Design an enzyme around this catalytic site. Structure first.
Site, PDB file in Angstrom:
ATOM      1  N   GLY A 288       0.790  -1.220   0.000  1.00  0.00           N
ATOM      2  CA  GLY A 288       0.000   0.000   0.000  1.00  0.00           C
ATOM      3  C   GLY A 288       0.827   1.276   0.000  1.00  0.00           C
TER       4      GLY A 288
ATOM      5  N   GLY B 139       4.821   3.866  -4.578  1.00  0.00           N
ATOM      6  CA  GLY B 139       4.600   5.147  -5.230  1.00  0.00           C
ATOM      7  C   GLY B 139       4.726   6.325  -4.287  1.00  0.00           C
TER       8      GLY B 139
END
Lengths: 32, 241
Positions: free
Chosen positions: B189, B192
């Site tokens: 999660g 990025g």
């Protein structure tokens, strides 16, 4: 932990057993 | 860039709740149904930089100014993705050059909770041992299979690629930087998301959460795409588009 070379797959992440024989996978978020 | 209106207070497995809006450039990438699958960083009003392996499509949405994803009282900004620019040298085999730019179809509105992070110079150097911060809504335990509601933050040291190789061998390329193995660990999660260090008074994006231990081992260094080794590409893309 693994055999250097093999490429497995987590829920929705790609893992590539690094030369040191360990599971290094991507850290994306999997809904399933 | 890199100057939050709400100064972050510092005392992701073993993280800690961030002060709401203290990391103004942190966005969340969500699918049609609102599912959070990756983090991202605003580099200016029209672009977001994220990891290439998140496989973002124009069918996804960028959410800014968000702290508690379960809340509906926050003043967030759901923005649409006009175009995705995946780095051509990305390899899903070596997970190298793990970076993707997202041009928004509607510029964000900077305010106290939404602003941009700074980009470094291709020549800029960040020493090993340097304490930096990473943030995100990633698992807080590999044994949770449920992301936290509130944005997490963690401080961690940078490792020299040389020491990092003692952990991962030759999987560590030049366009990769490691941090961690200090008690904390990015986790499912967090991809990025940013890895920022404060330099000369402003927060600079030096890393992008890429990959690491399959069980978010807090004693194994995490791997991040090295921004200094990818800025030229980032700059050229912005200049041309």
């Amino acid at each position: 932990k693994c055999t250097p070379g093999q490429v497995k797959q987590q829920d929705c992440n790609t893992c590539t057993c690094t030369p040191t024989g360990v599971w290094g996978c991507t850290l994306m978020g999997c809904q399933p | 860039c890199g100057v939050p209106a709400i100064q972050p207070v510092l005392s992701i497995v073993n993280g800690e709740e961030a002060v709401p809006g203290s990391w103004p450039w942190q966005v969340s990438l969500q699918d049609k149904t609102g599912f959070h699958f990756c983090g991202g960083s605003l580099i200016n009003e029209n672009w977001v930089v994220t990891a290439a392996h998140c496989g973002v499509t124009t069918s996804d949405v960028v959410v800014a100014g968000e702290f508690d994803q379960g809340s509906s009282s926050e003043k967030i900004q759901k923005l649409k993705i006009a175009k995705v620019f995946k780095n051509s040298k990305y390899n899903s085999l070596t997970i190298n050059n793990d970076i993707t730019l997202l041009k928004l179809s509607t510029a964000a509105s900077f305010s106290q909770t939404v602003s941009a992070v700074c980009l470094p110079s291709a020549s800029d150097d960040f020493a090993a041992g340097t304490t930096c911060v990473t943030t995100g809504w990633g698992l807080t335990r590999y044994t949770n299979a449920n992301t936290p509601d509130r944005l997490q933050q963690a401080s961690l040291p940078l490792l020299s690629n040389t020491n990092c190789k003692k952990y991962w061998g030759t999987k560590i390329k030049d366009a990769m930087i490691c941090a961690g193995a200090s008690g904390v660990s990015s986790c499912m999660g967090d991809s990025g998301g940013p890895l920022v260090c404060k330099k000369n008074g402003a927060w600079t994006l030096v890393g992008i959460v890429s990959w690491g231990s399959s069980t978010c081992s807090t004693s194994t260094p995490g791997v991040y795409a090295r921004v200094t080794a990818l800025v030229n590409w980032v700059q050229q893309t912005l200049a041309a588009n």
